[PDB]
């Protein structure tokens, strides 16, 4: 009843296995993986965005110098100039010709746009993956279970209880350093907090949008106003966040192999088809029925009708059933050579019922198990010319 | 080239394989947005050989 089985990690591929429960009628299984969310553990480092040089009003003493003070503003650059003769619309601003000094100061403050648009640095750990599994086994034909991958957590939705994982591959598309920009994910190597070079990425680094303090290395340097005019000419490197926005690499959600996609989320990488899962399930004995009730289907034969050497269910075959009673009968091929989309067939008195399947061998010689009745369906297949189907469901490529 | 072909200037019959597909109208606005390949004759009119 406890059917342990390793399962390839694919999303849209069934796992219609058969339980070889002694003393009772065998019961088919069916497992499907809707999602394979990874959700690695993450830790935010800092957020960067364009800055705004909030330059306050200059201090202009008409006759006399004025020493500046080292204010605690981030990147607070202050410098005093000498020998200035400012005009304004009302005429020349002072009667002195050399004692005129200007005290110009400027500091870098994060732009108002940081509230909506801002990159997010992230350092990630291994984390723990989760999946949504649908199991339509036996006669219940339904499940809707969210499950983990740790090899301890039971999942007991409906009547059955099972355990999943751990995954055979520790492959994580995320690197140790991950940068998230609004909706797309880039595995850019942000240097560290409080060390960004001016002009490059992370010129302005804030711990959090709420955090008041930040790290603004913009190489801001004021210079003398020209021709006696009241303003604050400041020379600084162009916004480093503006750069790398128009020349960033391909997002991770567009270069991650194994067909894995990301989202503005706990950063799950869903549909990351890689490795296998050691699935173990405990079927309740209630679903089991006495073996003495299943009709006998011995002395039957299998005939191939038309097999296509393709990925979709192009293979068909007719089975000459030789039964005694009437009832349901699970069908399954223990061999991985062929996969049968058909799940259950009712048996009449010495009837014949076609079924569909798919294979990957030119001359498929696969065993067919029909409610405790073995038969080999040997035949031939033909490759298709119009290779236009859904994604392959045979998942059985090997030597042919 | 030859995206639209007519047997003569007066010919009421013609061939036009231009991949014209209609699109859903945007924001409950009354219009007929269509997704259309660029004019085939405009191509080869900028990059015709000698």
């Amino acid at each position: 009843y406890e059917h342990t089985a390793v399962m390839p990690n694919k999303v849209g591929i069934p796992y219609k296995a058969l339980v070889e429960r002694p003393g009772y009628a065998p019961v088919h299984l069916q497992i499907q993986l809707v999602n394979t969310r990874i959700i690695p553990s993450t830790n935010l480092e800092y957020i960067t965005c364009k800055y705004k040089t909030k330059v306050p009003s200059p201090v202009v003493k008409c006759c006399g110098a004025t020493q500046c003070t080292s204010k605690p503003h981030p990147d607070y650059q202050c410098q005093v100039f000498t020998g200035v003769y400012p005009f304004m619309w009302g005429g020349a601003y002072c009667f002195c010709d050399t004692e005129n000094t200007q005290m110009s100061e400027a500091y870098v403050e994060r732009s108002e746009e940081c509230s909506i648009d801002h990159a997010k640095a992230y350092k990630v750990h291994t984390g723990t993956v989760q999946a949504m599994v649908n199991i339509t086994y036996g006669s219940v034909s339904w499940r809707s279970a969210d499950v983990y991958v740790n090899g301890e957590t039971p999942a007991k939705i409906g009547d059955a209880k099972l355990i999943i994982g751990p995954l055979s591959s520790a492959w994580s598309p995320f690197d140790n350093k991950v940068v998230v920009y609004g909706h797309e994910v880039y595995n850019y190597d942000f240097p560290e907090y409080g060390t960004g070079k001016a002009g490059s990425f992370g010129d302005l680094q804030s711990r959090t949008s709420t955090s008041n303090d930040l790290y603004a290395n913009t190489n801001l340097k004021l210079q003398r106003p020209q021709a006696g005019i009241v303003h604050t000419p400041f020379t600084q490197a162009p916004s480093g966040f503006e750069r790398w926005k128009r020349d960033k690499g391909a997002p991770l959600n567009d270069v991650a192999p194994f067909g894995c996609s990301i989202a503005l989320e706990p950063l799950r990488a869903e549909n990351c088809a890689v490795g296998s899962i050691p699935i173990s399930i405990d079927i309740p004995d209630a679903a089991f029925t006495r073996i003495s009730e299943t009709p006998t289907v011995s002395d039957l034969e299998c005939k191939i009708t038309e097999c296509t050497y393709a990925s979709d269910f192009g293979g068909i075959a007719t089975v000459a059933y030789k039964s005694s009673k009437a009832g349901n009968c699970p069908i399954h091929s223990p061999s991985g050579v062929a996969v049968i989309k058909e799940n259950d067939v009712t048996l009449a008195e010495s009837g014949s019922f076609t079924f569909h399947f798919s294979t990957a061998n030119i001359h498929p010689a696969f065993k067919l198990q029909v409610c405790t009745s073995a038969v080999t369906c040997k035949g031939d297949c033909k490759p298709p010319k119009d290779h236009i189907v859904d994604y392959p469901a045979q998942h059985t490529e090997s030597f042919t | 080239f030859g995206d639209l072909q007519s047997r003569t200037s007066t010919s009421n019959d013609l061939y036009a394989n231009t991949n014209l597909k209609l699109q859903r109208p945007q924001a409950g606005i009354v219009h007929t947005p269509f997704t259309q390949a660029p004019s085939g004759f405009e191509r080869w009119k900028r990059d015709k050989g000698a």
Partner: protein, 96 residues
């Protein structure tokens, strides 16, 4: 003013917000199939970048802005291939 910086903290009138603008859509490419290779016959109206990404172990990605009409090819392996032409939704593909 040498005296003091008076109060009068004034709200920014037009605060940037994350609205939803309407963006352009490139014409759908003309898909032509060959044996284990995908030919994308396409004609871009404006410079659009297309991205391709193999579903196998090795991504082998390729990003390429294209402006003039061009014909491109792609070796679609048994693992499969997916491509994103413009801002259209991504599409995947098989191999036999």
């Amino acid at each position: 003013g040498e005296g003091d910086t008076f109060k009068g903290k004034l709200h920014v009138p037009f605060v940037p917000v994350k609205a939803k603008c309407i963006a352009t859509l490139a014409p759908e490419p003309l898909v032509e199939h060959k044996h284990r290779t995908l030919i994308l016959h396409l004609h871009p109206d404006h410079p659009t970048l297309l991205t391709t990404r193999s579903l196998g172990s090795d991504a082998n990605p390729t990003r390429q802005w294209i402006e003039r009409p061009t014909t491109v090819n792609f070796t679609v392996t048994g693992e499969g291939l997916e491509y994103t032409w413009g801002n259209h939704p991504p599409k995947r593909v098989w191999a036999q």
